[PDB]
Amino acid sequence: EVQLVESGGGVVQPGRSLRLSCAASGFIFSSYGMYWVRQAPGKGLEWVAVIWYDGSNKYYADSVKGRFTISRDNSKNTLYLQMNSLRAEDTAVYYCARDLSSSSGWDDYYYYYGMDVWGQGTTVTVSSASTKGPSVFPLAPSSKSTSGGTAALGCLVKDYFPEPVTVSWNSGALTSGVHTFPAVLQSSGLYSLSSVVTVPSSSLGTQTYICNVNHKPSNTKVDKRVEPK
Amino acid sequence: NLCPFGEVFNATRFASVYAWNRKRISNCVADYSVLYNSASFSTFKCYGVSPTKLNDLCFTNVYADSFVIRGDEVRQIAPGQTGKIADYNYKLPDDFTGCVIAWNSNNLDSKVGGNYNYLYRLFRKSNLKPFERDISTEIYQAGSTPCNGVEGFNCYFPLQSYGFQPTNGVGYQPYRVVVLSFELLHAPATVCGPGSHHH
Amino acid sequence: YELTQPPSVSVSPGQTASITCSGDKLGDKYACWYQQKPGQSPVLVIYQDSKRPSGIPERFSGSNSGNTATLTISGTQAMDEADYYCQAWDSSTSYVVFGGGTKLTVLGQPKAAPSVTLFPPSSEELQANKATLVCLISDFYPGAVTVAWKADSSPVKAGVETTTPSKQSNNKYAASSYLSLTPEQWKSHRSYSCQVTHEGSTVEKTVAPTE
Ligand SMILES: *[C@@H]1O[C@H](CO)[C@@H](O)[C@H](O)[C@H]1NC(C)=O
Numbered sequence: 001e002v003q004l005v006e007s008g009g010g011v012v013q014p015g016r017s018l019r020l021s022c023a024a025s026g027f028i029f030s031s032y033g034m035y036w037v038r039q040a041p042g043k044g045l046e047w048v049a050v051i052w053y054d055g056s057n058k059y060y061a062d063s064v065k066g067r068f069t070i071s072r073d074n075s076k077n078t079l080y081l082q083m084n085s086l087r088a089e090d091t092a093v094y095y096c097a098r099d100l101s102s103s104s105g106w107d108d109y110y111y112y113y114g115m116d117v118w119g120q121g122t123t124v125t126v127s128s129a130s131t132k133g134p135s136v137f138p139l140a141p142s143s144k145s146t147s148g149g150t151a152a153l154g155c156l157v158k159d160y161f162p163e164p165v166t167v168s169w170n171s172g173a174l175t176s177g178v179h180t181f182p183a184v185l186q187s188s189g190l191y192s193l194s195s196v197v198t199v200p201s202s203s204l205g206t207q208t209y210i211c212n213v214n215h216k217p218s219n220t221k222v223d224k225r226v227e228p229k
Numbered sequence: 230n231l232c233p234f235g236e237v238f239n240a241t242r243f244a245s246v247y248a249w250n251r252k253r254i255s256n257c258v259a260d261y262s263v264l265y266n267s268a269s270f271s272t273f274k275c276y277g278v279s280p281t282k283l284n285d286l287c288f289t290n291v292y293a294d295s296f297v298i299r300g301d302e303v304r305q306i307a308p309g310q311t312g313k314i315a316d317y318n319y320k321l322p323d324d325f326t327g328c329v330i331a332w333n334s335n336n337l338d339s340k341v342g343g344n345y346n347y348l349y350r351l352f353r354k355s356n357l358k359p360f361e362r363d364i365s366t367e368i369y370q371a372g373s374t375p376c377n378g379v380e381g382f383n384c385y386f387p388l389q390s391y392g393f394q395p396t397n398g399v400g401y402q403p404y405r406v407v408v409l410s411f412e413l414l415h416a417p418a419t420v421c422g423p424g425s426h427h428h
Numbered sequence: 429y430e431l432t433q434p435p436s437v438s439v440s441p442g443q444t445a446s447i448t449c450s451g452d453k454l455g456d457k458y459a460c461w462y463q464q465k466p467g468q469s470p471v472l473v474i475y476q477d478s479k480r481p482s483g484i485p486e487r488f489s490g491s492n493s494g495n496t497a498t499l500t501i502s503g504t505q506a507m508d509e510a511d512y513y514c515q516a517w518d519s520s521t522s523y524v525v526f527g528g529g530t531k532l533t534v535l536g537q538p539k540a541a542p543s544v545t546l547f548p549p550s551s552e553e554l555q556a557n558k559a560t561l562v563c564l565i566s567d568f569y570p571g572a573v574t575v576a577w578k579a580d581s582s583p584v585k586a587g588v589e590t591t592t593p594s595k596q597s598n599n600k601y602a603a604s605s606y607l608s609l610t611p612e613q614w615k616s617h618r619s620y621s622c623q624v625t626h627e628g629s630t631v632e633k634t635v636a637p638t639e
Binding site: 035037042044045046047050057059061095097100112113114115116118119120121135137138139140142143145152154156158176179181182184185186192193194196198229 | 458460462464469470471472474475476481511513515517521522523524525526527528529545547548550551552553556560562564566589590591592594596597602603604606639
């Protein structure tokens with residue numbers, strides 16, 4: 001099986017630097033041009049760099065010229081991207097990709113066609129610190145939720161810099177009617193999201209509703225009961 | 230050191246045009262005067278550059294594509310030509326900056342009885358793109374019925390051989406060609422003339 | 429050098445779908461086409477203008493002429509709904525160029541109007557000296573929606589962050605918008621309103637500091 005595996009992404013502070021790896025297996029790596037391509041959240045694919053089958057020729061996109069360095073160890077089946085002077089607009093998933101054309105080795109000729117193999121990506125978030133856990137506030141169901149067939153209630157999970165947050169209801173017992181939203185990145189640099197559940201109006205007296213929020217990186221866990229107060 | 234142009238031009242054997250050979254030249258002092266002052270070249274057309282001031286400039290890379298064609302096909306090694314060669318064998322781009330060099334190789338590539346080592350591509354499903362090279366021996370289908378073995382109704386092998394005999398007409402004699410393309414990327418310039426700022 | 433694509437293209441299942449890609453003398457270079465479904469890596473569906481990689485369904489075809497490359501999907505299917513990018517590697521300088529992408533949508537569902545619920549700031553958050561209005565939009569099968577905030581029919585300028593639509597479990601879409609306020613300016617307007625626009629049809633919901 002042909003396989004590319006990216007690694008080395010993470011959270012990193014702007015102006016600092018970081019080295020990504022891409023491990024190839026299942027094809028003769030030393031005989032293929034290789035690419036780095038990135039995708040910022042909710043944006044398109046951006047070409048980053050490209051390197052010849054032997055590392056002789058290297059080409060970079062203008063946005064990263066002078067700051068990034070592409071390289072390969074053909075003996076170790078590996079592609080590297082050295083990212084220096086990281087700006088905030090570098091936050092993205094970074095894919096390594098292989099060109100479908102292979103050089104036989106005999107005369108310095110190479111024509112790039114499509115990129116047929118892609119890794120799964122490695123995520124690089126470049127933010128200015130502030131690794132905090134969230135504050136969870138309840139979104140009570142109001143009197144205009146009460147007069148439909150059913151009613152909505154939720155949890156606001158506000159102001160937590162480590163993007164990864166987990167939100168269940170009643171220790172996972174409550175599953176249907178639940179949408180947890182993607183987070184917004186506030187200009188403050190901190191993330192914030194909401195989870196909501198649609199629920200029978202008449203059950204607001206009997207059935208209790210607690211939302212469970214787990215923010216691993218800050219070792220935060222919060223249960224919050226949503227009453228209709 | 231001196232750029233190994235000797236190894237490219239005075240090369241003992243040359244390539245078929247369909248499988249044109251490229252040599253990247255880097256990290257050396259290129260004395261271009263040695264070329265344009267060998268007045269043995271039958272064609273020496275340069276596009277976009279000075280004749281001699283190349284001897285003062287530096288380049289990231291110099292690429293030398295080389296091959297053998299017949300004389301009357303040399304006119305096809307130029308921007309925006311059509312013909313068997315430029316369409317199916319070696320296409321130059323329209324914005325080409327570089328030099329085309331050709332000379333008659335009858336005394337080296339013809340032999341009494343005929344030389345059938347130098348080939349060219351006769352059939353292709355479409356035109357080559359600039360600086361593309363194709364060496365597939367896939368069976369060309371001109372007819373309607375698929376071929377999968379060797380030949381059938383209009384199922385031609387795509388390559389044909391030049392027949393280079395010493396007594397062929399000048400237009401049908403073998404010419405050796407070398408195409409120098411110059412590359413100036415935003416990186417260290419490694420191929421330099423002796424009259425540059427660097428030395 | 430730029431390659432420019434249509435931002436979105438929708439198509440009913442079974443219909444033919446076409447995505448264009450325009451650039452200067454693009455006919456003189458080879459064009460590739462990549463498919464990317466959500467949370468997946470890209471996959472090559474067309475290379476060399478028109479060639480189709482090994483294992484790619486035959487309904488994917490491609491052309492390139494003049495300055496326009498065109499990806500065509502005959503008999504478009506549910507599993508073809510994705511973002512599609514074109515790409516060109518310039519024969520010169522070995523420079524790679526992607527298109528802006530195209531959100532191909534396959535209409536496998538009937539249009540559904542959004543369900544908007546506006547939450548006023550929780551008293552816990554007020555006791556914490558902040559105030560956040562939460563506008564939750566759910567059950568709109570066509571993904572696109574537009575949000576607009578207002579303080580007493582006067583349009584709110586800043587303090588708004590809005591999510592892009594995301595599939596819920598029933599294959600419909602949902603989105604959220606948040607408006608940040610200090611408790612002063614919360615209490616100092618008669619009402620706030622969230623206006624949600626979906627396929628030309630707008631619905632608004634309103635809250636007041638009193639209620
Ligand atoms: C090739 O051989 C000829 C033989 O006389 C010589 O004059 C010339 O300098 C050599 N080198 C090149 C680059 O042609």
